[model samples]
Target: GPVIRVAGDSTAVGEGGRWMKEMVEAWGKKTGTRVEYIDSPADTNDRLALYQQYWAARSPDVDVYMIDVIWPGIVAPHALDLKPYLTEAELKEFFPRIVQNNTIRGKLTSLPFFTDAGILYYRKDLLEKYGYTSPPRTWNELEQMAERVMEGERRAGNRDFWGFVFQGKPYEGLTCDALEWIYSHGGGRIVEPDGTISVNNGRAALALNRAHGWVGRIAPQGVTSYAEEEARNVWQQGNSLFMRNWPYAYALGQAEGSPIRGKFGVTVLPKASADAPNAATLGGWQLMVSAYSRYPKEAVDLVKYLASYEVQKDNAVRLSRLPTRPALYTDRDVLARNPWFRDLLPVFQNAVSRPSDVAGARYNQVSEAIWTEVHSVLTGRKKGEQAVRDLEARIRRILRHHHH
Candidate 1:
């Protein structure tokens, strides 16, 4: 028997571990191999730092690693390559983007576990009651409709109602929301295809300005400090007309205790510009093996099990961790169990991955500067043009070091 250890964050803890446990047990039953997981810290930064420490120490005990979608280029040098282990046919079962993302310089380094994409969650009852047949198709309309909803709520003495909520904190979630604004307006904060920074363009300026304006008009002033939990809380309390979050929010909000249970509906994000439809940002985890693993065979078996059709179907039906496999999306049994699968498939198909590259590290710096200025302009801390000028200079500097 071979023991394969695992490491990751909270998302990778109980729920992820349970999913992996099922895979391990199934694999053992089929292949006569044993796998184990060593619990790690839930903090993303802490998990990354710990992986780095293990890499530096060259420990072979940690057989597998659960990585962020953005980590292949950064961690591939120290992770196991599974190219020779997986057949071309098996590899094709996964999404093209997943395979591309997990492959670092032609080497297969990881396997996508579960998938996620940004989607809009709105109050279904509210929309229907307000005479709206559908959610807004663009940001401007969304704002207008949200304002109408809020006005109605206010008129009815519902002081807690708000227009929208999102993960506006100074981290990864902020960048996710910012990207839709850039892309939907026929512009992007960074260059497309690979996401190199380009700040002086008119389209880019319009993107930021629009996002800032929307935040100012409908989003709470305190949203600038919010993350997933805060945003979820606002929506769960039925205080927001809409929320931009991952698929998990659907199940969480529908749970028995939630105030907005059974009232929320999921759909693609509203476009930044009327001319374009809504665009969603991709988010999910992947499975990678340690470069120094002694149980490489067991690790590979674990990954195969996790990526199997049965596992993906189970995840979608039970845990709401949207599967990366297209076949599972259309599976009758899976869809029957999860009626939301139909809605989620479109969101997944239309999802856009983040800019990934060796210079992807600077992604954070660029987004931080851009959002900071956006917030400033909205709050009168800085003029829009002045903020744009500052961002232009900073983006130019960042691109110099990180452009593909």
Candidate 2:
């Protein structure tokens, strides 16, 4: 077999790109092949630009791509359709929603390596001490609980403590966080499945307004500059009543010497209303064979191996990534290592996907427009209603240009 070149970000490929190479090399040794890991930028947007340059020239240097969950549609034309290579049984083993998201125009362009969704990490000790038996089920409940706990802690000289913390930076992180807020409130997607712009409305405005009000009241004024790690740092330091983050934070927050170790609990994000379901923004990466690869069979085989149950289990245990296979949620070994998986299964099942498939290659532009407008509201430069109106207009213009 040929030396298969695989490209992935730091998380998948690991620090200095050695962990994945080691794993792949071990697999290659058994099959009499070679595997080389190609480094990509850590930032997703930068990595996309690099992949675009390579794919535009139909370069075959990289055989497999570690695609972002939202990128299958945008890069479908340049990626091999895996439906022919993957068995129906193998496809069925993956989460149905992941398969649906990775399919573009009836082509299975990628295999989900891992999946992620937002989860609420709350201070268990704080909630218990505050006389609460469970996590908040609705946004209003969360606000009241957070405010009560935060005020009590602040009066006790914990002035740095906050009510809730989440990603609010003016970037893709903001887009993911904002989408969760909007969707949980029954706001239709910014760009609906049929390409209609529907974000500038009462529900969307209501969502943004509530989030904006958190700034300087419950959330710190510096939240507008905080990304995932920033928010995690605050929560891990035992400074917040609740934290909105992904599953990966579980392993880190409970690791040795963590300030909040053994004092936290995980649950689905709170909903806007009693009847409404909590919404978590879907995230994770996938594996795809490059359309230009000379070793297509070899690339597909590697992808399948990576997506297999054993490898996914290894990833979950070692790297703490959420597995894409549904059974792994209850896998005895996986649950032993990460007990939160038992509680997170429903969060992953009901996760909401961004409208990347509908927006196609222009999805980045759409996300940018949304985050910019929403960030303006969070930063107090625009009211939530005005921001949503501006966002709707901007997304509509982008879609029109995209169509033309």
Candidate 3:
């Protein structure tokens, strides 16, 4: 039993850490093996950079790596293929979609840990008071609902709060928020079933336009500079009626000192065009034992323990980390602890993973440019058609640069 070296962002290092710590206690109690966590501040992008640095240089400090899902294809050749270490039946126990994403060229490169997908958090009281039964179900519905709620608030003299809130900063958060609309409207970074690239087309442009442009009109004026946590704070402070965020906000928003505690409602994001399904951009990490590690067996066992049903369910209920195993969602005890699990299951099951390819790097690059131009259009710095045209050219050029 070696110390399980874990490196990740706040999700994996902070919130994710507490859940894993719980898992370690339960795992050691059940299997009689020690799994110690070594925390690191490796955020999503930089975590990948560190993996490349360590693996290329053959460092031995990290035994078990908690990596972003998009890193598999990039690190496949360098990381261990765990198919030989674990049974097919055991591997099959994980959610198929997660397993599929974890594999690189049919090799099991990592074990699917907790899962996460983008969701919309709304002020339940506001929606109810406004005579709305539930959150919006489509982009148009969202616009109408938000406007109605905001108008109601305005008439009642509640000017501090607005309609919608989201992460619109020129960073990864903005790119993730943009993808929900893109994929929901029959648009994808790389088209499914064959993975062809064509996101600069008419339908895709329309989706992107509504995603970013509509935010400017309804969301708070400062949303363009907010990240996930910042936007969540706005919602917790009752400054916005709805906020796009991941599951962690559940625990934080309900905790002591939260202004909107007990008033938050979680739901899947509204659909793009109604004919298309609601899309939630996947966000979470998976744990893998490095092939370069000297203690591969201990690493696999620790990873397996971390992914166990008991640990997963506990994390789901207490820490708001969505479990990757399907059974955990149906557990009665889990449901008893967190009644919201039932509400979250359907959303998690139908949620989509981001495009998994080397093109992921280019995807981020191309998206930032698109958002920049889209933000300009939404803020009146440019016209919609001009922004679309500029983004089309920029995305095409960037995609060409990374067309490996």
Candidate 4:
């Protein structure tokens, strides 16, 4: 009856749960506190709404929160300041950038559990065989290469071959994918850190319009509804030239007997120009405790255990999930099973941030406004300039309407 209550992803307790169940039970016995997991809605929109309801209501029903990388800032006011709960050495185990991202006003709001970035996965065999020297470094170049390859491979044979696939759906995912597009081209991160609204510009407009050009041309029209798995399945089929997904998709492509094994390569997301730096939207999940929790000790302790070295290593080996801990990259088991972890080491640490920190408690509103406008452009309802023009107004409305 007495158990630590955690609210987060349903998959945490998946078939025999390498992500959570086993660890929860073992830790529960020693601490005399079991855990009852409340599966948040898989729909990102619904998930955010549910968490907001709990926090806005200030309920003590959920003791721990599973915060997305774009959160921590949104949850800061409602989360416990974890600085006092954890030791300095324990906090030192994670990446400094990540830890800092979760910190607000010197308060550690959440602990990093899984980390990801919008990575470019391409066909190595395809690039060289097509006579291309390397992956495209800029968006225009990516368009040229994608078009050249799509026609090159089609005329040479495979008619099903599209050029590039990514999450184009109008959900929280599309928000992450869309942010890379706008920000990669010097688009101010929707809202500047100082709370300035910045999406209404020519550079950001052209950036989003470029991606909209890909639909039904190089990318599938149906990608409008594609999530991470949808893009991965198409990429793994060996039918596409390039894919933009997270690091977890790497191991899946290399799994035994997979069609795309050894044919693909991973790299940074394309930029506006060669001189412009490569950019990717930071993505991950964090462990947080509810400030309204009835069981603060149990909640924070479970969070600490969830992010422990042993648990992160298990996550890498079993789920091929990226670890937030730096040391896990070199662990023998972590390296052997997910070799991509070695190369992806820097991607996790170097990811560009979303505007969550600045958007604060209003982030869900901010993201929905963004993705809705961006998705409208992708779906052919609006031009890039107008969408972003409307987005700047929408963000100002969303943010200024409230002081918090």
Candidate 5:
């Protein structure tokens, strides 16, 4: 067999990333094959650019690629259609919704191992101590509670504590956070399911402006520089009252010696108001074999091995990534390790799918435009009203069609 090379975010940090590396290495050793792992950039947008450049050149340097859950449509042309390899029985074990997302125009482009939806991690002990009975249901409620706890904690001599922490950086992570706000505020998803550019609305502007107000007041001034890890660091260190992050952080937060271990609770993110609905940005990753791989069959095998039930359950218990397989959600061990997974059923049921599928191949262009403008709003360089207008124009230019 030819030496195989794989590229993905798993090449470096993160609990799940470590498990990915371990599982790949374990597979290589068991099969007696040489496997090379390539590191992807921290920024997903930057990572996508590099993949695009390499794929454009028809490079065979990487045989297997870990694609974002939303990328099946965008990367379908460059990937080997997985349909021929998967069985109807095998496919039925995984979540059908995700499998549907991974299929691009009838081509099965990728196999999902784990899936993601946004979540809110709160200081439960602090919430109760402050006389709050439950996690916040609305953004305003969250703001008040976060402020109350931060001030009380500050008086108790932890001046480093902040009200809230989240991914505010100019990248895909920001897009998720921003989209959550927009959807929760009754603003249309950046792009309509029908492919119309719909982010420029009063509700969307108000949502962005409200987040802007949190930058220096409740959120850290440097939140614009914060991505997932940075936000988690503040959260795990017990320096923040609430943190918006993915489910992966759940295992980390409750790890044996963690400062906030057993003191925090996971819940659906806050909505704009009590009458509004909560929205969690849908996210996940898929294992794809490059069309250019010399050993396509071998690469495919590696992908399947990674997506198997045993491997996925290990990820759930140790890495806290939600399993894409529906059955694993009810597994005894998985449930024991992540009790909050049950609470996420509604969150996942109502997860807001990004317009990636609707945007198709040019999705990156539209997403970059979104994250960039949202970044500007957070940094105070652009007002929410003007920012939405500019973002709409950018999308209009990148995507030639603008549905009225």
Candidate 6:
């Protein structure tokens, strides 16, 4: 029996962590292998730094790494090429976008585990109280409804309440939020698939400018510092009318003792206009084997087990995780456990991915450029048009330097 170390954040160790350990342990027992779990940092940037250190040193301490959706392009050379190990039919079982995202330079460097996409979480009771029969269908509608509801709630004595909350910190979460805004407004990606920079446009400016109006009006001024948990905390406390977060928050929001339990609802994020298409940033995790591992075969076996249909289905039922397999979205057992999955299937199907695939290892730099500029607009330090122009210039310089 071979011993393997699996490193991931809390999502893989316990219930809030996605029940990853239980499933992995079961696989270990059946395969006659010893499995060890290493808890990495929850922050995406910190996790990437830790992994970079290990991979740079060619360390074999961790055999399997639970990678972020945006990491395949950055860590491909340091991870195993999984194409030879998976059949075409097997690969077809997972989400096509995820599979495409996990492949870099024609190498399948990782396997899609659980998948994610952005969604709108709203106070169902509050909407009903406000005489709203449905959630907002456009950004204009969201702002109008949020302002009305927020003013009403404050007048009724919930003085500290907010209208909307989302991940806005100067990190990876901000990148996801920024992308949703730009794409929903008909803005192209920061970097086109053909390696062209295209962010400084009227549509992109309109999106950012609209989002800027949220600060201090609908969203709190401190929202600029909020991450996933912070936003979830605000929303789950029933203090906000709407929230933008990943699917993982569904289970937590419904947990016993939650303030908003039984009163909250989720739906696709609103578009910039009723005629525009809804947009959600593609988000999720993948399983990868270290290129430096001595037990590559065993590591591959573990990844295969973890990414299997049974494991994904179990994860959806137990953790409310959105599975990578399309079939699981409608599975009777999965639907029985997470009925919201039915409505969200279309959101996931049409989700937008960041430019990580096109930018390759420079994705971090590209994302940083975007978030920093957008943050300036949100913080009132720069106008939306100026921020977009500056962002485009900066990204162009980065691409030029890289190419040279």
Say what the RMSD of model 6 is: 1.9
lDDT: worst 10-residue window of model 1:
8-17
lDDT of 1 by residue, 1-404 (tens): 56667764355322555656666667767876665666666434456777888888998878888887767777887778889988888889899878887887798889988888888899999998899999888877888899899989989998777889987766667667767766677665344565545545666567767666666468887887777778888898999999988887776677778899889788888876667645788778888888889888778777777777887787777667788898887789877766877966866877776665534555445556666766665565665557667877876776675645
Model 4 Cα displacement at 223 (Å)?
1.4
List the candidate 1 regions with Cα displacement exceeding 4 Å. Answer: 9-47, 194-196, 214-217, 343-346, 358-380, 401-403
Superposed model 2: Cα runs more than 4 Å off: 11-22, 401-404
Error of 6 at 286 (Å): 0.7
Tens-digit lDDT string for candidate 3 (1-404): 55555543344333666666566666666776655665554235545655678888887777777777666766676667888977878877789888887786688888888788899888889888989898888888888988888888878888776788887776666667777867777776533424345555666667766755555467877787777777877788887888888887887777788898899788888876668867888877788888788778777787777777776776777777777887787788777766777987877777776555645435446545756865675565765456656766776676664543
* Steric overlap count per candidate: 1, 0, 0, 0, 0, 1
Report RMSD (Å) for each prediction in the order shown. Answer: 3.2, 2.5, 3.4, 2.8, 1.6, 1.9
Better of 1 and 3 by lDDT: 1
Could you tell me which 10 consecutive residues in candidate 5 have the lowest summed lDDT? 8-17
TM-score of each: 0.87, 0.92, 0.85, 0.89, 0.96, 0.95
Candidate 1: lDDT over CA atoms?
Answer: 0.74
- Give stretches of model 5 more than 4 Å off: 402-404
User: In model 4, which range of ten residues has the least summed lDDT?
Assistant: 10-19
lDDT by residue for model 4 (346-404), tens: 76666777788778767888988988999999888899999999999998888876553
The TM-score, computed over Cα atoms with residue i paired to residue i, of candidate 4 is: 0.89
Model 6 pairs in collision: 11-17
Compose the digit string of candidate 2's lDDT tens values, residues 1-404: 58898886565323224556666776787688888888876556668889999999999899998898978878999999999987788799998888988998898989999998998999999999999999999999999998999989999999889999998988888889999899889887777777888898899899999999999899999999988778988898899999998887877777889999889989999989977667999899899999999999998988898888998888788667899998888899999998878877878877888889788888888888999999998988998899999998998888885651
**Candidate 5 RMSD to the real structure:** 1.6
Residue 19 lDDT, candidate 3, scale 0-100:
60
Clashing pairs in 3: none
